Amino acid sequence: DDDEPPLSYEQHIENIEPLDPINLPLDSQDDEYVKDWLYDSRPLEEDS
Amino acid sequence: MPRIKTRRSKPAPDGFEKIKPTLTDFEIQLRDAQKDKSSKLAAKSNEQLWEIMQLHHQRSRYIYTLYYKRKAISKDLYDWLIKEKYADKLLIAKWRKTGYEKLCCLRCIQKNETNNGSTCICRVPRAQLEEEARKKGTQVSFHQCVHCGCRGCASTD
Amino acid sequence: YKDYSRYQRPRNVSKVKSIKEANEWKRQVSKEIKQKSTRIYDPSLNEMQIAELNDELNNLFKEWKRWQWHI
Amino acid sequence: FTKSELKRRRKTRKGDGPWGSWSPKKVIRNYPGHPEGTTALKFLPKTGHLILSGGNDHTIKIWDFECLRDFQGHNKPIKALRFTEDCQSFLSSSFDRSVKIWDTETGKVKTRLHLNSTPADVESRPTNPHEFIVGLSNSKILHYDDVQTYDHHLSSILALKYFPDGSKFISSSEDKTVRIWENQINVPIKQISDTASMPFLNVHPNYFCAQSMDNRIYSFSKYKRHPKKIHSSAGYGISLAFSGDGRYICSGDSKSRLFTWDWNTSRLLIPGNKPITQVDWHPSKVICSGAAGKIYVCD
Amino acid sequence: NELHPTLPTNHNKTKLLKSLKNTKYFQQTTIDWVEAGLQLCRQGHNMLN
Amino acid sequence: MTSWRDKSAKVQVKESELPSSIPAQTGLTFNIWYNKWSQGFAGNTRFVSPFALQPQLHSGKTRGDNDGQLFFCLFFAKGMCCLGPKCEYLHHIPDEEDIGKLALRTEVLDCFGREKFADYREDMGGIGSFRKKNKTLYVGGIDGALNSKHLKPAQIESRIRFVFSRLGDIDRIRYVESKNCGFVKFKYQANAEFAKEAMSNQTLLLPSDKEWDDRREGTGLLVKWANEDPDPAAQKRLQEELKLESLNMMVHLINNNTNSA
Amino acid sequence: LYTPKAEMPPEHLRKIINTHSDMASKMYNTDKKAFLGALKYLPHAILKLLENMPHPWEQAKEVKVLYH
Ligand SMILES: [Zn+2]
Ligand SMILES: [Zn+2]
Ligand SMILES: [Zn+2]
Ligand SMILES: [Zn+2]
């Protein structure tokens, strides 16, 4: 509603658990190399 | 990596629950400080900022003392705390250096932000500040740093 | 709020209410007293007009007596 | 300066360091312990050291402002309780058609007042006169010698107050009127019909009263309210409280009528059970009895 | 888009945020994206108001 | 010393007890840039100050005393300073030692640190001008201060003589009944600037009066800067003191040329 | 010389935006000017926000912000 202000993050959002994301089932054998890191936020971010 | 317990977040290491009750107690203090205590003074509003910089300092100082002074947490836990934002990576690192072990803030050392290229006053030893109070004949005209309110991070003090 | 610049006299003086309220109705007479007093001395030459305007003055000035009388 | 001398100086700051020095309403406390709902609450007028809280379990439990003592002796729900200023007496009134006195000294019933027709829902102690003012479903106010009966409105009388000057007794009823009583003449001095049942009233500690209704809280020598279908209390700080049956605590100023805050209480570990039945301030704190079987302290 | 290329300039040594970071008045932290969005909506409404 | 230097300054008003920042509603919607009310008419806007200085009570050492602060707390004068001993400015009646510190500074700005302006405000209110060393206050609006009690004409001056005597050394106090107003002249300008903000929007009630419960309902008095004194009994005193000021400056000025040679 | 701009707690930023909810005091006068002066920069902040929007696979995305 346009009457209500945008709700504060720390009271109404920060505490709640997020939800499941849109991740494909994923194969275990065909997709072995990529299933560890395909859905990371930054993939392979600390892999030197 | 995010403070939120996402699915991406790696679960807790082993020694965490022995220090979780203190860490939650620092957390609830931080939630209280940000509650929009509406004040009128500018002197009161930045004191509310000064309490927040104090609480966040105290939490990281505790985690620093556990890993380095007491070695009572594992390194896998201690890296997990830093990756999950419970402690400040850089503020801890300054404490390892021999001059900056009682450091107020990352903000306080910075030469660039100030007018002249100097650290803030709360980086000067008090006994030196007492000396110009002897020189000027006037008691020391410093009480709290503006960007935290510190009263001497100085290692000698 | 509620201005007092909108409404009428209101007609009866005794029916008006507490003293902090009739104070502003009272100055809501005095301005038209001031305005039409300045409209007395004008050389605008309409002698019939300023006669009916003189009667309106005497009417409002009697009201000004009555608002003071209630207080 | 030396490292030892500089060590003894550094402890002279009060805190450990580095901050160690050189040189609206909210809910503070929740109290359970009544078995049934809590209908009335009164506070000690002299010391502020205790509460006197009625109940729907017929008991009276004296709470420390911990539970000190229990006062039984009524057979049914205690609708109203009032403590006396110049006396060490407590006048309790219940649904059992009796106004029972209490000696605070020995904790025993002294006197029972008689001849009410039906359940007695109000007791107010007149300040100077050593009188008792009870009102009820009897549709009349009985002035008790601690004598006069006042031809009442037409329906049951919800709230009654006493004041030392004229209009000694202010009364409120479910015929949607509020009468100001001339008790020596024993007839109405003034009628206030502006309410559209008036369940609660409160005397300002300005010589006025705050009158309640379903959706409009008025004052009498308005207050901006939306739909708060129906207790009132006036702090010495001007602030005027309003207890709701929809769990809303409506805080207001008794100068601009403005409502500066509205809260919502957490029920207990039913949603219909969360009203506030009664409320009172001390002689900076707010003590509200709720139908969730708990007393809450608002700071 | 491919018929008319607009070539970038090489003397643009001052980006916005890089020069804007240098001042004492700005500070730097890390927070959630949704929190960043809600702050911008609260700030952006507060600016237009 | 015994009344001021012995104790420390006391918190006058609690920070929760401070008034709301929004003014009383004299319009339809609040304006956010200009913190005022916009639509409709504009009513009155003056009210009696809820707070007042008890000078022998609230004076004491503060934080500005140890720092060598030159300026007095603005809300010490209104009776409104919530910092108490933690406040950066001074909390006491200006003295000869204090105005001696302000001597190089008083020329362009007041004892409260606010900068003086070129010419006076239209109603002679506000801070003041640096062009004239005004030491005389126009005590006006006395009817709304007294809550429309009559009293007499000289008892009103008795209220003025008691209140302003606590706020500094006085040159003279004159009350005029036909003009229903007072003229208070001080020894120093800094007392006059201090007593101006101290006594703006106050009331001369003295709780031995019956309206003491209704001191808030009134309008409140106006202390503004005074114009010149038009009677020649005072005009001849002006150029007499201006003559003595000039003779005291020439002795100081030939010693500058004595050292210059 | 030079250093790496300081890292600040999230609670330091969140206190500020909570404090500037209802700004009617006299202390806010410079900060009221600041909001108008930042209005020119505001389409730049919208670009840095919408390009950093979390893609569908991720629940929450922690971005690094620069605030007044
Ligand atoms: Zn610091
Ligand atoms: Zn510092
Ligand atoms: Zn510091
Ligand atoms: Zn002060």
XYZ file of N, CA and C in Angstrom, chain G residues 3-57:
165
model
N 45.722 5.523 2.797
C 45.321 4.250 3.454
C 44.096 3.692 2.720
N 43.508 2.602 3.223
C 42.319 2.028 2.578
C 41.032 2.463 3.295
N 40.335 3.475 2.763
C 39.116 3.935 3.415
C 38.662 2.954 4.487
N 38.256 3.493 5.633
C 37.913 2.688 6.794
C 36.636 1.893 6.562
N 36.577 0.708 7.155
C 35.376 -0.110 7.119
C 34.558 0.165 8.371
N 33.266 0.383 8.191
C 32.408 0.822 9.269
C 31.386 -0.249 9.604
N 30.880 -0.287 10.835
C 29.843 -1.270 11.163
C 28.579 -0.973 10.437
N 27.723 -1.979 10.209
C 26.398 -1.715 9.659
C 25.506 -0.915 10.587
N 25.692 -1.067 11.903
C 24.870 -0.351 12.869
C 25.159 1.138 12.872
N 26.338 1.550 12.410
C 26.620 2.972 12.296
C 25.787 3.610 11.201
N 25.643 2.933 10.065
C 24.800 3.456 8.998
C 23.332 3.420 9.381
N 22.906 2.342 10.025
C 21.488 2.143 10.267
C 20.967 3.107 11.322
N 21.825 3.490 12.269
C 21.458 4.511 13.242
C 21.181 5.840 12.570
N 22.010 6.195 11.584
C 21.881 7.465 10.877
C 20.545 7.549 10.160
N 20.197 6.509 9.410
C 18.955 6.548 8.658
C 17.746 6.386 9.562
N 17.907 5.753 10.718
C 16.828 5.800 11.693
C 16.694 7.192 12.293
N 17.817 7.881 12.518
C 17.769 9.181 13.180
C 17.161 10.249 12.279
N 17.379 10.156 10.974
C 16.810 11.115 10.043
C 15.430 10.717 9.555
N 14.660 10.004 10.370
C 13.281 9.706 10.014
C 12.433 10.973 10.018
N 12.324 11.618 11.175
C 11.529 12.832 11.340
C 12.461 13.963 11.764
N 12.865 14.768 10.800
C 13.879 15.778 11.040
C 13.193 17.145 11.116
N 13.011 17.615 12.345
C 12.423 18.917 12.608
C 13.279 19.794 13.502
N 14.393 19.287 14.012
C 15.227 20.082 14.893
C 16.009 21.131 14.106
N 16.678 22.016 14.848
C 17.504 23.039 14.214
C 18.841 22.472 13.767
N 19.300 21.394 14.411
C 20.575 20.778 14.048
C 20.565 20.188 12.644
N 19.393 19.886 12.117
C 19.246 19.212 10.844
C 19.332 20.133 9.640
N 19.579 21.430 9.844
C 19.470 22.407 8.763
C 20.512 22.188 7.677
N 21.752 21.888 8.060
C 22.753 21.555 7.055
C 22.426 20.236 6.380
N 21.913 19.277 7.146
C 21.607 17.969 6.590
C 20.391 18.015 5.680
N 19.474 18.951 5.924
C 18.373 19.166 4.996
C 18.890 19.643 3.649
N 19.891 20.531 3.659
C 20.526 20.961 2.415
C 21.202 19.800 1.712
N 21.772 18.883 2.490
C 22.528 17.774 1.930
C 21.643 16.845 1.117
N 20.368 16.720 1.489
C 19.499 15.804 0.756
C 19.166 16.369 -0.611
N 18.957 17.680 -0.682
C 18.740 18.320 -1.968
C 20.000 18.277 -2.817
N 21.163 18.465 -2.197
C 22.396 18.427 -2.954
C 22.764 17.050 -3.451
N 22.253 16.008 -2.810
C 22.478 14.657 -3.279
C 21.483 14.236 -4.332
N 20.505 15.082 -4.645
C 19.467 14.683 -5.582
C 20.018 14.563 -6.994
N 21.058 15.334 -7.311
C 21.682 15.220 -8.624
C 22.389 13.876 -8.787
N 22.931 13.335 -7.698
C 23.672 12.087 -7.745
C 22.762 10.875 -7.713
N 21.477 11.072 -7.459
C 20.582 9.946 -7.213
C 20.347 9.007 -8.400
N 20.327 9.432 -9.678
C 20.294 8.410 -10.741
C 21.556 7.583 -10.844
N 22.675 8.061 -10.307
C 23.860 7.217 -10.264
C 23.706 6.104 -9.240
N 23.107 6.408 -8.087
C 22.903 5.387 -7.064
C 21.918 4.328 -7.528
N 20.936 4.724 -8.334
C 19.977 3.768 -8.872
C 20.653 2.830 -9.861
N 21.616 3.340 -10.632
C 22.370 2.473 -11.532
C 23.214 1.466 -10.767
N 23.891 1.903 -9.707
C 24.701 0.987 -8.921
C 23.855 0.032 -8.102
N 22.582 0.345 -7.901
C 21.700 -0.570 -7.200
C 21.100 -1.607 -8.133
N 20.606 -1.193 -9.292
C 19.983 -2.154 -10.187
C 20.981 -3.020 -10.927
N 22.229 -2.591 -11.077
C 23.185 -3.513 -11.666
C 23.655 -4.545 -10.661
N 23.569 -4.236 -9.379
C 23.995 -5.137 -8.327
C 22.850 -5.957 -7.765
N 21.731 -6.022 -8.478
C 20.572 -6.769 -8.020
C 20.880 -8.263 -7.970
N 20.442 -8.971 -6.924
C 20.736 -10.397 -6.823
C 20.010 -11.204 -7.878
N 20.756 -12.104 -8.479
C 20.276 -12.974 -9.524
C 19.442 -14.067 -8.867
N 18.609 -14.812 -9.624
C 17.620 -15.687 -8.964
C 18.190 -16.784 -8.084
N 19.422 -17.228 -8.327
C 19.934 -18.368 -7.576
C 20.308 -18.004 -6.152
